């Protein structure tokens, strides 16, 4: 447990969000979320976007990816916007995206780009409230090379919000990324 | 030398220009020490204090806003040993304090401060001669305030010629513009100047490269997927400054590249004040409110009118820049109509912009293959729309160009380039382009 | 489930493998596996080549590793083949390598270089027709450095056969990996 | 199990630790020590390094991190010491190192600084001796950037010990990482 | 300058080489827009409209079948603002269109359609006058398609020289080769000539550096191991030519490198055709024929017959360079002997080759030291049998010396290498040649 | 040119010092080419045979004890191909083999023996006019083995100057000292010369820079925390030589940088010998004993005495350098207090040492701002205690000042770098240094 006052540099979200995981030990509930963030992570390695769009992201989806801008950890008076929104997608948005993919006349998508992505660090917990809700969290590499000799690396944390579908199936609701490279290193066309 | 590069009346350029490293060392010297760069908006130092860092080349200045109201600009260099004093992006200080050894900086560029003054450095040390390295020149356009480390430099309004004319219906009379922060940042491997032209008026582009996008998100520029057939003559202008700043006119696109989710509440709200604006700005200038300017402002400032983004191409090598994206909304938009265009402007030209993403495979091979030996003294042919450019129209300001899909503000460009590259002062520029308007219509 | 008329992006290839993984939910099956792919990275790790070999390989492995050609996506003519095999070894062409790294007059291999492998994303299911198989795959990214200043990471996804022996064992029969960079960055001599 | 007289290339320490594993297959042991590292990541990336101290560190700690000199693999004369302590750290010199990062006046954590950390191919075997006592085995990558376009990655494997405390806990008892890059790629003030 | 980087005879040359960044540039000039450069095969693209892309040193091109049968090869740059045009490695195509703003090329060079050409371009733009950059001269080599970017250049045959006397067993009077791609492709940190010139003639480093696997595999050239016991005289002999490409023979080593499980079949096979070879050729040439020979064909294409292997060393700058890797097979092999040759050459000397690696280790090192100060003016010393070499041998056909041991080559290449790194064309290279017989034999 | 880059007296120097890449080229030659560098330690090459590797600028050297006990030290290249001969950091050799071909050398530098000699080399090789190339001056002090490249430089120990003095009682009168190994080995993107002038005398930093280990770690040094008061003068001093280095002298801080958890143990310690040493040497000289030095030996080579570091800033470009990091120990201290000594040195000032990584901060920037275009051309002031500074005290030997807050080592410092910048031999920067205190020391 996470005392503010005394440990310095810690965020009261981040510290907020690690007091959900960690406590209740529920196996059941990891081996669902490794299927769950695997088989998601698969669709997106293959480039099965539309299953990913139908199967994986629930229809009231917030897909939500931010760069920071850098202040002086000392700031008390500047109020400005804090961050800017790389990705912030509702259903609607995101289908666009998926839709630019698949679309035959997608120049830098030929020839086939190569997506090889790793996930590690995943735990999870109920929802006290709402307990159809889970909060889980990951880690994710994921490697984009194309055209021979172009590669990217991406490394970032994904506070995920998902919920248990009437179908038995479980969707995602919420992504939150906080991109951790204030300028990124190239241009982040691909769903983290 | 570095004469020759671009031809007579901008027509071909040398491909060596988007790769050569000796040149961009040129550049360094005398397009960003001698030009207007965009470093920031009022809407974000806005109270006294505030300040921002902002690239000006490939230096990084201090900007901060005085408690007389004023804005000065000073190198985040240290006048001791040459630390970098502020490493945040964007805050509000009551001063610098640079922590190698603890030199203190008014906001106003002032040594106050130098710890032991008294035992240590005594007679050898006058704080008044150890200021900030300042920005001369510093002036506004409607909010945006650009810098120049060139004082001899014309005033901002001046440089920005007769491409002034067509920025005010949007830039001033809509009410005014703020700017919304933080911006985007990313890295893209392609000199500065193939974004620069892009934006200064490649309109031609946007039928093929963006092909996708508008079958599948249906902008207001759907009337152009395949470049299968061009919005008739009724369709826009493409126009050309002294100073090298252009832009291109596509009538009442006031939607510009946005997706059909917000095409809706930005056509109403900027129709309705569309009419406003005619009874005091004439019918001319009212639509041109509502139409859609792509430009580039000189050297590495690029903006969108209606699709409401405003990028900076810095510079960082010959085969590499850093580019800025922020968003710009007009001040008497609904808050959460700024909120979603705010987020649409990112969401197109941003880091994940899928506009931007489209065009970074032509901007990057663009430059790549710049470097390759029997390439890089290939004539690069900006042709389009040649020999249909005027001066003088009775009521288009510049040197104008009867299509959007031109190339007349890419030989501006390039013209007003090369008078900068091959000369060694202000002076010696304007004495290259007394006869700007001629060089560009010429045999016509 | 994907249909690939409509997810246009989608391999053949990638599809039938995906169609595999993600049905059964065998958490003793993935303990099992977790178990093996681990011992075989910390293995190869520690440079027990000889280990390796005789305890997790097969005798008659195959072991492919592809680096594929960049077609357009349009291609409808061009039919030569497709693939280079930087990897294609049955076992007696393992032991000549694992033979070769051992040998003492193998000059790279003097100072000793370092391996680490990050092994993620595993998932797998039973063979329908013949049970003893094991469908396996996995992520994984290849840390090599030598020599001071000299290094390189390897980034791949494997699929993998493995089969179940007489001890109680279970032994590699076929590892097949798409090499995703086409211009390799760097000589590819490990056992990914 | 490993013959070193065959195995050429294997350390005998290497290949002492490899024999405490995948013996046993204690799937309650693994989910324990899975909960333990990632817990400890997780506080570790939100900066929280008082409670990773007062909770994860046991107080008998030794927290060691060697950068191995590059000798020749048939060197049998040369008896200097092998090893730099870059880590070599008990609970009062680690408490120092905490400190130093959450004071205000340290430079260069303004701005905060984003640290994220994926940790792989975890496995535990109890002490035979001492069933207190966990030897615990992982592999990190960890990811630092900082002031905008500043990047620096680091790979390791961490080989551990870890007890178990009567209040209930499990804490952190011994730390040994041999980093395998010789010549650091940047100043390597973070924890693994 | 440039004079005086390799001494008289080739006997040594200035370390600087495999590492000044200044040569680099001026070897683009001198060496690679000049000389003949190994494109592709028949076999790899056959019917029409079939293409490959490959490097002429740093250019890239696009190699493409005409309909007439013909071949033609054009620079992948567009000819408006200089993108690249395809972006695959093979394909086969009614025509070649540049995505940026659609111009639209024939696989004839020439282009064909330009989006809105009546509407925009009107009479800016002829479009006969806008075909892509054709590289002047493509000839051919018993499939091998050879271009060069300099028209003064001799005929291929003719610049191969008397090398060309040495392939034929292997490139004609077998059959012919078929070449299997796709090739694997690598960087590997080492300037391009490092590995130009251990093909060109280094039997040498076989016993020590690659000790490793042959005392593991059994390649047939076991009896080397150790350095220890050269093949007595009867071992192989080493030869050079006018235009710098070179190679050492080494007789009956048919399979080798190759390891213990192909070298039965490879040698049973290669025997039996000897045989046949030896009543249509005659005993000396179809013993070549079963030999192995290593070699590099000026400036920077290798072979390895009967171990089979075609490399291409594609500069990329003064310390690293791109390393394709083909195997070539025989015509009238069975499909399986086709199909484990072709793995095999992979499993030797491609990307996850044991010998390539062995021999990269030597590569790296030797450029990185170029560049230190106190080593960059050292001499290295290519004198491995000087003295012992001959032209005009009753029966073989070059600068002749008598073991594959030598640097007969090495000194062969070189000199051709300093007569072109120190003249301005074709005409000038030959005034330095016309005794270039006299001056490696020299003394002797 | 390379003339008028440090300004007379040493008070300023360009700021483009830190970043020009053609200077750093120069620097090769007139700078490591020209002057002494670390090499080893006696204590780590002791038995014959035994060898490391070290980096004299560019430049590997290989550093091998002889049979008769000497020392001598060749370029890790080879003469044939050029390859790298020796690759482990430390070992104990009967000779160097390089594995390309298999060419033996002795521990002595000499060719031994050649493969296949008098079969294929014969009267093409001599053997003897082969060695490897020899570093012609190695020299000593207290165990510290020190290289140069040209044979006209004085001897180490005039070289060292008036510094020689201040160094003594630490490195001759404690007994003597032994280097522990192995070095710490890191990257940091910074010009080495700010290591240098960061170690020849920058104490003005302590107080803010390290305001937070102070404050944590209470170190004897804690008394300048804020750099709010100054230990009265009754603090220090600093001092620079006519060849450059130069050092800042701190009294009775024997513990220097060091956590609390040694500092009773180690001031303890280095109190009782300071007793013993004022009855062999004085008063004076056993307090400097007990007392904290930070200096530079020219061009690279850095101490912390008491803290017991002992650093070496390695090339590798304009804006980069490896730092090597060993303790060193008086030999007479008890082993655990080696063992912590030793560890406690790397825990502050190695890789992962809190000391240096705070400093890395002021270090990577101070040299990315000199590649700025409106910063290359900016002064770096030395002012700090100028006009405070006197030659021959009789007392303290060398241009001393009267704080260790001083920048008079600076000064020092960089008049001798800007000596050897602009002069083509020894004989020529002796020409520039015949009036070298009169310089540093003039207006006063
Ligand atoms: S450099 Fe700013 S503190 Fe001296
Ligand atoms: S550059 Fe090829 S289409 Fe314009
Ligand atoms: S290079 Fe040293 S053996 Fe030839
Ligand atoms: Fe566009
Ligand atoms: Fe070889
Ligand atoms: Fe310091």
Chains 1, 3, 4 share one sequence.
Request: glycine share 8%; charged share 25%.
């Amino acid at each position: 447990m996470i005392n503010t006052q005394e440990d310095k540099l810690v965020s009261a979200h981040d510290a907020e969000e690690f007091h959900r995981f960690y406590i209740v030990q529920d196996d059941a509930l990891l081996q669902e979320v490794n299927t769950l963030l695997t088989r998601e992570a698969h669709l997106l390695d293959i480039q099965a976007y539309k299953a990913w769009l139908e199967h994986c992201v629930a229809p009231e989806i917030k897909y939500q990816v931010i760069s920071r801008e850098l202040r002086s950890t000392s700031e008390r008076r500047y109020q400005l916007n804090d961050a800017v929104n790389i990705y912030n997608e509702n259903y609607q948005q995101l289908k666009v995206r998926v839709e630019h993919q698949m679309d035959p006349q997608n120049w830098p998508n030929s020839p086939k780009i190569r997506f090889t992505r790793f996930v590690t660090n995943v735990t999870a917990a109920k929802d006290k409230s709402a307990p159809e809700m889970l909060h889980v969290r990951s880690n994710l590499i994921l490697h984009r090379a194309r055209r021979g000799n172009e590669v990217d690396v991406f490394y970032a944390t994904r506070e995920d919000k998902w919920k248990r579908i009437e179908g038995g199936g479980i969707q995602l609701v919420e992504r939150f990324v906080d991109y951790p490279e204030r300028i990124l290193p190239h241009n982040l066309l691909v769903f983290l | 030398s570095y004469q020759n590069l671009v031809s007579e009346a901008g027509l071909t350029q040398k491909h060596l220009i988007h790769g050569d490293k000796e040149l961009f060392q040129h550049e360094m010297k005398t397009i960003f020490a001698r030009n207007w760069l965009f470093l920031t908006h009022d809407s974000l130092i806005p109270s006294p204090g505030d300040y921002v860092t902002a690239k000006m080349g490939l230096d990084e200045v201090i900007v901060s806003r005085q408690n007389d109201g004023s804005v000065r600009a000073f190198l985040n260099v240290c006048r001791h040993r040459g630390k970098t004093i502020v490493h945040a992006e964007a805050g509000n200080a009551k001063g610098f304090v640079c922590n190698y050894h603890g030199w203190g900086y008014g906001t106003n560029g002032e040594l106050q401060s130098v710890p032991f003054e008294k035992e240590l450095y005594g007679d050898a040390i006058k704080k008044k001669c150890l200021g900030l390295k300042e920005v001369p020149r510093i002036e506004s356009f409607h909010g945006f305030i650009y810098g120049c480390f060139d004082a001899e430099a014309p005033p901002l309004i001046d440089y920005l010629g007769d491409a002034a004319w067509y920025m005010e219906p949007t830039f001033k009379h809509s009410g005014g513009l703020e700017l919304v922060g933080p911006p985007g940042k990313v890295v893209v491997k392609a000199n500065w100047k193939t974004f620069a032209e892009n934006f200064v008026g490649d309109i031609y582009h946007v039928g093929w490269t963006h092909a996708s996008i508008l079958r599948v998100g249906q902008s207001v520029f759907t009337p152009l997927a395949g470049n299968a057939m061009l919005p008739p003559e009724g369709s826009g202008l493409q126009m050309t400054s002294k100073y090298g700043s252009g832009m291109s006119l596509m009538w009442d696109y006031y939607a510009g590249n946005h997706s059909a989710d917000l095409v809706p509440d930005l056509m109403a709200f900027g129709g309705a004040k569309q009419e406003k604006l005619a009874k005091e700005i004439g019918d001319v200038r009212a639509r041109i409110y509502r139409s859609h300017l792509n430009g580039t402002i000189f050297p590495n400032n690029s903006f969108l009118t209606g699709s409401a983004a405003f990028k900076v191409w810095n510079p960082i090598d010959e085969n590499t820049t850093e580019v800025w994206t922020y968003a710009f909304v007009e001040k008497d938009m609904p808050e959460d109509l700024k909120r979603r265009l705010a987020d649409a402007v990112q969401r197109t030209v941003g880091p994940g912009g899928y506009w931007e993403s489209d065009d970074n495979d032509n901007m990057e091979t663009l430059s790549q293959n710049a470097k390759k030996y029997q390439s890089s003294n290939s004539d690069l042919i900006a042709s389009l729309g040649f020999g249909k450019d005027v001066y003088g129209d009775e009521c288009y300001p510049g040197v104008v160009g009867p299509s959007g899909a031109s190339e007349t503000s890419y030989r501006g460009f390039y013209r007003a380039y090369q008078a900068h590259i091959s000369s060694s002062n202000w002076a010696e520029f304007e004495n290259a382009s007394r006869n700007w308007h001629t060089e560009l219509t010429k045999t016509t």
